[PDB]
Amino acid sequence: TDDPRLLSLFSAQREEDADIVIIGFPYDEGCVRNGGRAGAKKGPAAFRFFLQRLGSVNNLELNVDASHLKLYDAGDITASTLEEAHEKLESKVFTVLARGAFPFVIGGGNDQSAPNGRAMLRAFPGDVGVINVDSHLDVRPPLQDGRVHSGTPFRQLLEESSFSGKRFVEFACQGSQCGALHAQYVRDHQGHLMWLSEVRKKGAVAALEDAFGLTGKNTFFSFDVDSLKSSDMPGVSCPAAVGLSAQEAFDMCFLAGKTPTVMMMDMSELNPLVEEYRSPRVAVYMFYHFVLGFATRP
Ligand SMILES: [Cl-]
Secondary structure: OOOOEHHHHOOOOOHHHOOEEEEEEOOOHHHHHOOOOOOHHHHHHHHHHHHOOOOEOEEOOOOEEOOOOOEEEEEEOOOOOHHHHHHHHHHHHHHHHHOOOEEEEEEOOHHHHHHHHHHHHHHOOOOOEEEEEOOOOOOOOOOOOOOOOOOOHHHHHHOOOOOOHHHEEEEEEOOOOOOHHHHHHHHHOOOEEEEHHHHHHHOHHHHHHHHHHHHOOOEEEEEEHHHEEOOOOOOEOOOEOOOEOHHHHHHHHHHHHHOOOEEEEEEEOEOOOOOOOHHHHHHHHHHHHHHHHHHOOO
């Protein structure tokens, strides 16, 4: 064609030949357990639909040519329970990290972020940083029988002995959604809360630069799309009245892509049952901006 897009970068015949490996996590039981609306299990299929259609690989507005990057779709994690699904996701992500490639995980519920974090902690012993981009802090306690959910993943990570809380950042969190007890929990573990209002004051990219300074080496960039305002991103499990704009999200993902300390990324809560067209496009354009950033990464 006279207009190659992301689809054209899937030139890797073998997974090991790819710079970036996409892994799908089509599960939303974690959401329903956390009192949310089902539908995020369709996130990966919606994302793939527009992945085949969008994103100029040579972008003359930003002056980035991503045509040399190689992408690979590893398919979906397949399991008969949510817990086996988490184990398989953890193991797959680890293999990608272990050979120095970049895993990008498309959800699915935010519960995926726990196994992703464990893969990081094993790949980079005692030397991991984590940013959680979410309107919520996601440090809720499990259900009565020990059942984890879309609101517990960073409580699980902060309880890891090898993980330093000083290298944990809650980014674009919202006071109206987040309990004093849960903020306290993060603060008492030495984590950092960069509230939406603080992010706005500084500018999203500037604020994310500061966050990457605190997370340091071997950073997991964990992007929950319900951190975006629902005017731009309605199709998520918990739609936000206020939040990050699409452009802020794009600029943040570009920064993540270009920052050589960011070693993996996930994207949670995309919910096509809530809204099926505009929202998956935003999600794909977020990934696209990461890809452009990655093309420039020193
Ligand atoms: Cl807003």
